[PDB]
RNA sequence: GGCACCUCGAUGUCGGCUCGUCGCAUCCUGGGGCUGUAGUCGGUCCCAAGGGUUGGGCUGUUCGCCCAUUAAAGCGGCACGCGAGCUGGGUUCAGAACGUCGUGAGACAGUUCGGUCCCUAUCCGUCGCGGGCGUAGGUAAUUUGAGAGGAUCUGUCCUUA
RNA sequence: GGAUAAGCGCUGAAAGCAUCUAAGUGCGAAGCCCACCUCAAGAUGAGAUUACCCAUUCGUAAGAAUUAAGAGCCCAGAGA
């Protein structure tokens, strides 16, 4: 019910109304390309595995033009899902101007891939003390109590990090100033450079 | 003298199918004898590697004749390996939801805990309110009593 | 031996203890494990010797 | 309120094993003897 | 005992189905239905009821004597249908009628109501004096308990909803 | 405290830093009862371990004290949690000194200055990414969700008045 | 949301009364579970759906070798 098929071009700030300089952002607002409804009977869920991003001939496949089989025309690149649907056509559907889940938008992205990091670097424990003749600094700390001959899991200790999709709740923009090709959003919308920002809304709202 | 024994089964196995049900039957007294048939222990052909694993079918598995307040003080448990891994499915709860592991976990307590025990024990046939499915083969209803 | 013979006895609905009890009640035969070996194809030997035990409890 | 050794306190009291718990029934809000 | 040995007359054609809880009673309220004991040892007689006992231990006889009181509650419950005592004593504790889920006004920043699923048969005589009607004593007493469930009486002055006896033992101070 | 049963061909024994986990005899937040509770603020216990449970000065050292606080400034367990993670202020080298004891050699946890903390991860276990196979064809997309985790806190003011 | 702990209920029964209990019915908590988010069919039970290739050649018994649909090597670069 939210065809938000699109990426950003970056992160900015603009005053909008009564001044009010706001960290501002955008989505490219490409026309939505939604396939058929695919109701609960053949598959117990409800959602749409919506296609997006309009390939040329090279990046396709006979299950991709062969996805223009069981679609009608125009093979695409990306496919997500949206539960909460309206449904118009098997393969490609109606564009940005409709909004049917909420304007505290709970926006979903796929975070910036910063790599393998230090132990603090996103796990956020205290870095060790530097001075006073102690070797110990930049190492996270002990983890195994002595009474078991084990260590536990669960404690975040390291990890190659960044390609982790996040669904942040209630991003705050009002009824969007539209365009043929803009979507105003606010500020630190997650994701990365050239990352699709599709979003369902009002799940805590 | 030496080979007076006989397996007579350890390649030439049998395969038979049994709708086994009573809507309310008590859990232990159903459980150990359906354990006996899923062994094939009642079949006169036992081998420790027999594979007389019966197609033990249950439908309509809503009720145990529940002695005492066992739907209030039966309470199950589990432990995920995350520390402090208590997760408990409890006594009357999930009986009405999914009375499946309400049976076959107890039949895991019945069975010889090995690869054959987990073979037929993980080849049970379990239905809780059904008329089951796939009567393409031939099923046969087994008894009532605890024998 | 005893397990498969109480398997076939239990197929005749007979329990091993009262069967053997009927074997001590029974004839010159207290023969045990060849009587276990009749698990192959012996309704005559198995169920008829079981009937010998039925007229031994009787 | 709580005393495991419940002995009678007011006249015409009542001793119950309510839900397997020996509670105390009186007309006075002062003493309402919880078993424990 | 001295209940189940005694009889309960069923006047005015109560129209009981003897099948199970299917036992239905008839009055000016009409043909209602509550329960049975379990299904068994309930000899529903005619023009009266003589429910038998299967045995006389405190499970056996005593719990159909329970249902001598319960089918008794169907008989005299349907015979008129009634309520309990209910009076909203308070310096501003007023109560009026809003359709059938009606207004009870403590003074909280929420507004209080009354709802009954099948039987109000109702009158606010005044914001002091209220009465409802139900048929089951259980429905009545749980309904008036629902009236208690929004503002209780005090140990200090008259509040809450009156029942004619409480032996208030009203505490003091100053 | 006692006990000498493993540890003398090695069980490194303070306190602290870091990193936590569980228990509840619950410190606050939750509900409820009683009150010698008009309320406001209290006492009191019942159920409750979801979450949270301050920062500094001094004390090497626990305990404890002070300040100012908040929702409160919990108690313990875990090799008085953790030295193949760390420090080394504490006995626990050898010096030197005092006091006191011993003729003396020295000693007396009595004090104090200085005082010698290695390990290039093999397994298991942890964290993150891969290959080989499988899922009765080879594929290529899609998801359900069996299950597993995370997260849960709390003022302040106004209205109701 | 639901199940509730504690607690508070109606009717009731030995015990004609009484009685939140014995059946039978309620209310009721940061507890629990679901619901909020994430990992998720190696969930061997390996799911379910969408499309494509199709059903080849060699005695093929055994297999062997093409090859489709593809997928990949190889190269470029980074949102990684």
UniProtKB/Swiss-Prot annotation, chain A:
Pfam families documented for this protein: Ribosomal_L3
Biological process according to GO: translation
Domain of life: Bacteria
InterPro entries: Ribosomal_uL3, Ribosomal_uL3_bac/org-type, Ribosomal_uL3_CS, Transl_B-barrel_sf
GO annotations of cellular component type: cytosolic large ribosomal subunit
Coiled coil: none
Alphabetic keyword roster: Ribonucleoprotein, Ribosomal protein, RNA-binding, rRNA-binding
PROSITE patterns: RIBOSOMAL_L3
Annotated PANTHER family: 50S RIBOSOMAL PROTEIN L3, LARGE RIBOSOMAL SUBUNIT PROTEIN UL3C
Function, in words: One of the primary rRNA binding proteins, it binds directly near the 3'-end of the 23S rRNA, where it nucleates assembly of the 50S subunit.
Oligomer status and interactors: Part of the 50S ribosomal subunit. Forms a cluster with proteins L14 and L19.
HAMAP family assigned to the protein according to its UniProt record, in alphabetical order: Ribosomal_uL3_B
Name this polypeptide is given: Large ribosomal subunit protein uL3
Gene: rplC
Swiss-Prot record, chain C:
Interval of the full protein contained in this chain: 61 to 118 of 119
Species per Swiss-Prot/TrEMBL record: Lactococcus lactis subsp. cremoris (strain MG1363)
Annotated function: Binds directly to 23S ribosomal RNA and is necessary for the in vitro assembly process of the 50S ribosomal subunit. It is not involved in the protein synthesizing functions of that subunit.
Top-rank taxon: Bacteria
Family: Belongs to the bacterial ribosomal protein bL20 family.
Protein name, per record: Large ribosomal subunit protein bL20
Curated annotation (Swiss-Prot), chain D:
GO cellular component, one term: ribosome
Any single GO BP term: translation
MF terms in GO: structural constituent of ribosome
PROSITE patterns, sorted: RIBOSOMAL_L36 (PS00828)
Family classification: Belongs to the bacterial ribosomal protein bL36 family.
HAMAP family, sorted: Ribosomal_bL36 (MF_00251)
Name of the protein in question: Large ribosomal subunit protein bL36
Organism: Lactococcus lactis subsp. cremoris (strain MG1363)
From Swiss-Prot, chain E:
Keyword Phosphoprotein among UniProt keywords: no
GO cellular-component term (any): cytosolic large ribosomal subunit
GO biological process, one term: cytoplasmic translation
Keyword vocabulary terms for this entry: Ribonucleoprotein, Ribosomal protein, RNA-binding, rRNA-binding
PROSITE patterns (UniProt xref): RIBOSOMAL_L6_1
GO molecular function terms listed in the Swiss-Prot or TrEMBL record: rRNA binding; structural constituent of ribosome
The organism's place on the tree of life at top rank: Bacteria
Function: This protein binds to the 23S rRNA, and is important in its secondary structure. It is located near the subunit interface in the base of the L7/L12 stalk, and near the tRNA binding site of the peptidyltransferase center.
Stored PANTHER family: 60S/50S RIBOSOMAL PROTEIN L6/L9, LARGE RIBOSOMAL SUBUNIT PROTEIN UL6M
Family indicated by similarity: Belongs to the universal ribosomal protein uL6 family.
Cross-referenced HAMAP family: Ribosomal_uL6_B
Assembly with partners or alone: Part of the 50S ribosomal subunit.
Protein name, UniProt field: Large ribosomal subunit protein uL6
Encoding gene (name): rplF
């Amino acid at each position: 019910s939210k065809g938000i098929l699109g990426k950003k071009v970056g992160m900015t700030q603009i005053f909008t109304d009564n001044g009010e300089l706001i960290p501002v952002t955008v989505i490219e607002a490409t026309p939505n390309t939604v396939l058929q409804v695919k109701s609960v009977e053949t598959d117990g869920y409800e959602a749409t595995q919506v296609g997006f991003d309009t390939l040329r001939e090279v990046l396709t496949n006979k299950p991709a033009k062969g996805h223009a089989a069981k679609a009608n025309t125009t093979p695409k690149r990306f496919v997500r899902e949206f539960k909460g649907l309206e449904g118009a056509e098997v393969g490609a559907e109606i564009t940005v101007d409709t909004f049917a889940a909420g304007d505290v938008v709970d926006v979903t992205g796929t975070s910036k891939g910063k790599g393998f990091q230090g132990p603090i670097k996103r796990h956020g424990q205290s870095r060790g003390p530097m001075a006073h003749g102690s070797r110990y600094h930049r190492r996270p700390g002990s983890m195994g109590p002595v009474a078991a001959n084990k260590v536990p899991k669960g404690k975040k200790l390291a990890g190659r990090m960044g390609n982790k999709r996040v669904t942040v709740q209630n991003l705050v923009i009002a009824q969007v100033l539209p365009e043929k090709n803009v979507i105003l959003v606010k500020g630190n919308v997650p994701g990365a450079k050239k990352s699709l920002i599709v979003v369902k809304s009002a799940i805590k709202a | 003298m030496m080979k007076t024994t006989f397996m007579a089964n350890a390649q030439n196995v049998d395969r038979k199918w049994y709708v086994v049900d009573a809507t309310d039957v008590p859990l232990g007294r159903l459980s150990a004898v359906v354990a006996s048939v899923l062994r094939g222990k009642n079949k006169p052909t036992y081998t420790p590697h027999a594979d007389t694993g019966d197609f033990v079918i249950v439908v309509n598995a809503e009720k145990i004749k529940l002695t005492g307040k066992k739907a209030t003080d039966k309470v199950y448990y589990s432990h995920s390996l995350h520390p402090g891994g208590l997760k408990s499915v409890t006594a009357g709860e999930l009986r009405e939801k999914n009375a499946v592991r309400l049976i076959e976990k107890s039949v895991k307590g019945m069975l010889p805990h090995n690869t054959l025990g987990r073979a037929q024990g993980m080849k049970l046939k379990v239905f809780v309110g059904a008329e089951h499915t796939h009567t393409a083969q031939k099923p046969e209803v087994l008894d009532i009593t605890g024998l | 031996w005893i397990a498969r013979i109480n398997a076939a006895a239990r197929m005749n609905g007979l329990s091993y203890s009262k069967l053997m009890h009927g074997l001590k009640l029974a004839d010159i035969e207290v023969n045990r494990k060849m009587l276990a070996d009749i698990a192959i194809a012996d309704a005559a030997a198995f169920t008829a010797l079981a009937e010998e035990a039925k007229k031994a409890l009787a | 309120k709580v005393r495991p050794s419940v002995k009678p306190i007011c006249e015409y009291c009542k001793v119950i094993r309510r839900n397997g718990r020996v509670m105390v029934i009186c007309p006075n809000p002062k003493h309402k003897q919880r078993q424990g | 005992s001295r209940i189940g040995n005694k009889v309960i007359v069923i006047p005015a054609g109560v129209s009981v189905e003897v099948n199970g809880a299917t036992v239905t009673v008839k009055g000016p309220k009409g043909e209602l239905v509550r329960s049975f004991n379990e299904n068994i040892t309930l000899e529903i007689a005619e023009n009266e009821i003589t429910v038998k006992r299967p045995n006389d231990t405190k499970e056996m006889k005593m719990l159909h004597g329970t249902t001598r009181a319960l089918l008794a509650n169907m008989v005299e419950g349907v015979s008129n249908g009634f309520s309990k005592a209910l009076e909203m004593i308070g310096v501003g504790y007023r109560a009026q009628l809003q359709g059938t889920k009606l207004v009870l006004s403590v003074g909280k920043s929420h507004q209080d109501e009354v709802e009954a699923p099948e039987n109000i048969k109702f009158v606010v005589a005044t914001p002091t004096s209220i009465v409802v009607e139900g048929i089951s004593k259980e429905a009545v007493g749980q309904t008036a308990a629902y009236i208690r469930s929004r503002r209780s009486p005090e140990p200090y002055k008259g509040k809450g909803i009156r029942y004619v006896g409480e032996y208030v033992r009203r505490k003091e101070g100053k």
